[PDB]
């Protein structure tokens, strides 16, 4: 990690003091505004109690600049193959008649198919009329009836959730690190809010948004990738259009639940005296899923899947320009006034000056205990804080400068007393 970049101080209004003997502790309740960093940079916030050795950092790790897709209307759909059941009953035989077989309701199940059994499946009951006589079976000369009981059956084992995105929310996945050490990972977009151990956090400035996404529908596939369709969202179903048979959950597509909505008279029938062929013309969603599979060249952005959180995102270009307003909600902050000693070193110093990325530095801190190590300069424009540990590791953070020939003596105090430290390095100009 390249460490933190923007490091400011907290005001005395949202900072109180309430000691209980030797161990002086304070609380943080209010709202503090800090400038967000770029891709890679963080945002640390040091705290100063009643003295100088007390230092509590509040770093917020920034992953990158994502553009989450705000979901609106969604529905579950998939491929379905109807299974027709023929039952040619003779005329004047139980329920087979010339008037009852024709005018037959689709939402009624008499004794012709009551022995099959109840099942929550989008089914229907039809009724046709063929012929009679002794050529096919029947004592009466009237044409026999033909009851049809066709129910849907998903021949596949996968399901798809077709949804859309009415607006692209610029989501910023932030990994906020608490004061005690509880590292949590959250996200902020446009003007959202979350919940942290020290309070909450929200986003202020967000001047990065793309409009015009209602004419595109997205398809989610659990396990595999996503896809994009160059067509507006489907609301009302109809024959010969993408989005006919729809449902509401995964079981409505896999197990074919009755509660799914569909268009009437969607199953064709081609009876052949003693044969039956009940087939439909449902559009296979895997055809469009494989035709318009991500990534695809759309205008000037790249659409792909997301990481961690399930959803659709977009890859844009540029920098990260936003404002993070830390929301302190009365959090108890404790810190021991007796720190341990330690010594630091210097490695390299590469990067840039007066830019959003900044410049990294390698600092080898060798201490004997677990704590912190605050550092500053002479004029009062740089602030360096690094968690000290018993060992020898390389740390450092982003240090912004205004000169390519970096030459300033630093003063670090990891135990209360300052120590001299000289750094050097050549940087380049990167806006």
């Amino acid at each position: 990690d390249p460490g933190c970049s923007e490091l400011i101080q907290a005001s005395s209004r949202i900072t109180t003091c309430s000691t209980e003997g030797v161990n002086t502790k304070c609380r943080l309740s209010g709202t503090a505004l800090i400038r967000a960093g770029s891709v890679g940079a963080e945002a640390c916030l040091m705290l100063k109690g009643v003295k100088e050795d007390q230092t509590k950092f509040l770093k917020i790790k920034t992953v990158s600049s994502e553009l989450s897709c705000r979901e609106g209307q969604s529905y579950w759909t998939g491929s379905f193959s109807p299974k027709c059941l023929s039952s040619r009953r003779c005329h004047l035989v139980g329920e087979c008649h010339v008037n009852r077989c024709l005018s037959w309701r689709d939402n009624e199940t008499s004794a012709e198919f009551s022995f099959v059994g109840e099942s929550t499946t989008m089914r229907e009951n039809k009724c046709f009329e063929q012929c009679g006589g002794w050529g096919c079976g029947c004592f009466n000369v009237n044409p026999s009836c033909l009851f049809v009981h066709t129910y849907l059956q998903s021949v596949r084992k996968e399901a798809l959730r077709v949804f859309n995105c009415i607006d692209w929310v610029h989501k910023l996945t932030l990994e906020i690190t608490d004061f005690d050490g509880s590292v949590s990972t959250i996200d902020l977009g446009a003007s959202s809010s979350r919940f942290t151990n020290w309070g909450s956090v929200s986003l202020s400035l967000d001047a990065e948004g793309i409009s015009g996404s209602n004419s595109f529908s997205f398809i989610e596939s659990p396990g595999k990738g996503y896809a994009i369709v160059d067509e507006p969202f489907s609301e009302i179903p109809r024959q010969g259009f993408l989005g006919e048979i729809r449902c509401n959950s995964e079981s409505s597509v896999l197990s074919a639940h009755e509660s799914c909505l569909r268009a009437p008279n969607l199953i064709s029938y081609k009876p052949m005296i003693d044969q039956l062929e009940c087939t439909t013309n449902l559009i296979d969603p895997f055809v469009v899923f494989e035709r318009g599979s991500l990534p695809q060249t759309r205008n000037d952005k790249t659409f792909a899947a997301s990481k961690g959180n399930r959803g659709v995102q977009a890859f844009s270009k540029g920098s990260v320009q936003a404002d993070l307003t830390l929301m302190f909600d009365n959090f108890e902050v404790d810190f021991v006034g007796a720190a341990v000693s330690c010594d630091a070193a210097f490695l390299n110093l590469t990067g840039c000056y007066s830019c959003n990325a900044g410049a990294r530095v390698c600092l080898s801190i060798t201490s004997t205990g677990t704590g912190s190590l605050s550092a500053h300069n002479k004029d009062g424009s740089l602030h360096i804080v690094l968690p000290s540990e018993n060992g020898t590791k390389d740390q450092c953070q982003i240090l912004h400068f205004t000169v390519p020939e970096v030459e300033e003596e630093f003063m670090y105090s990891c135990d209360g007393d300052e120590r001299p430290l000289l750094v050097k390095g050549t940087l380049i100009a990167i806006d």
Binding site: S182, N197, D329, N330, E332
Partner: protein, 301 residues
């Protein structure tokens, strides 16, 4: 959908240590018996949380199973000396106990358990904060909190009350007060771990994680309907046993089933198993999670 709300796993003892008077009718606690410390737990309009989670254990069963400890004294008498530790934690609570009740148990602060005691013939009132004089008086105790016990040994003594902007809730002296402090009786969640304090809650995330455990199956004896029958007499997979037993795929997957050659029908209880909790972003397993109505002091100014 199984109406097995009376079958209790483990052993089935509900009488508490301190008021051992109704032990003749609640031993073991099964479909029979009229125990005063279990009848009100299933009545519509009292403790719906225990109605939703009834296939596990209770606080009394947790005490009998060496899960929840008992304070000293475990049953503080109300008519004896002049001062007892079991009063500051009782006056701050606001409950509603029916008439014809002598004792009333609740949860303390040190993670153990402390109840009250009234000498005969004293009965409770509409709130239960004081036992006044005089159907017949029940020789048991009334549950003052809507909680449920479970078999767990998860350690968690490094956690305290996770409530922000609260001065002194219940009897716990958290932060100080410098302005306006409320005192309205409001419900607050809590979860006590093993050998810890009365840790309150703020965000609860309950779930159901069932597992093949011996204390997660219920059954009733068959005879020429719901009858009492011990589950410990069920043979294992090719092992041994006294009588016989049978069940479905869950009961027969771990035990031996003899179909009609048995005297009972073991069935898997719905929701019984392992109920974990999500506190401070870390999944933990509590002991007796529930609600209570104590004095909450919130800093408004």
């Amino acid at each position: 959908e199984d109406p097995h709300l009376r079958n209790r796993p483990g052993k089935g003892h509900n009488y508490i240590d301190g008021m051992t008077q109704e032990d003749a009718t609640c031993k073991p606690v099964t479909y029979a018996g009229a125990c005063s410390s279990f009848d009100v737990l299933l009545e519509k309009g009292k403790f719906p949380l225990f109605q939703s989670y009834a296939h596990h254990r209770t606080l009394l069963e947790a005490v009998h199973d060496t899960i929840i400890a008992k304070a000293d004294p475990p049953s503080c008498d109300l008519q004896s000396a002049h001062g007892n530790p079991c009063m500051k934690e009782k006056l701050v609570m606001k409950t509603h106990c029916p008439n014809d009740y002598q004792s009333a148990h609740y949860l303390n602060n040190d993670g153990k358990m402390a109840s009250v005691k009234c000498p005969p013939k004293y009965e409770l009132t509409e709130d239960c904060n004081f036992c006044r004089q005089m159907a017949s008086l029940k020789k048991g105790s009334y549950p003052l909190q809507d909680l449920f016990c479970q078999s767990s040994e998860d350690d968690g003594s490094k956690l305290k009350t996770k409530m922000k902007g609260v001065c002194e809730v219940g009897v716990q002296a958290l932060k100080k007060c410098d302005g306006q402090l409320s005192t309205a009786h409001e419900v607050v969640p809590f979860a006590v771990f093993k050998n810890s304090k009365k840790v309150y809650l703020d965000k609860l995330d309950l779930k159901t994680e069932e597992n093949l455990l011996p204390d997660s199956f219920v059954c009733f004896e068959h005879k020429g309907e719901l009858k009492s029958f011990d589950i410990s007499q069920c043979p294992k997979i090719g092992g041994h046993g006294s009588k016989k037993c049978t069940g479905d795929a869950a009961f027969c997957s771990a035990y031996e089933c003899t179909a009609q050659y048995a005297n009972a029908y073991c069935s898997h209880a719905n929701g019984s198993g392992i109920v974990q909790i999500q506190v401070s972003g870390v999944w933990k397993k509590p002991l007796c999670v529930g609600y209570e109505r104590v004095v909450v002091k919130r800093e408004l100014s």
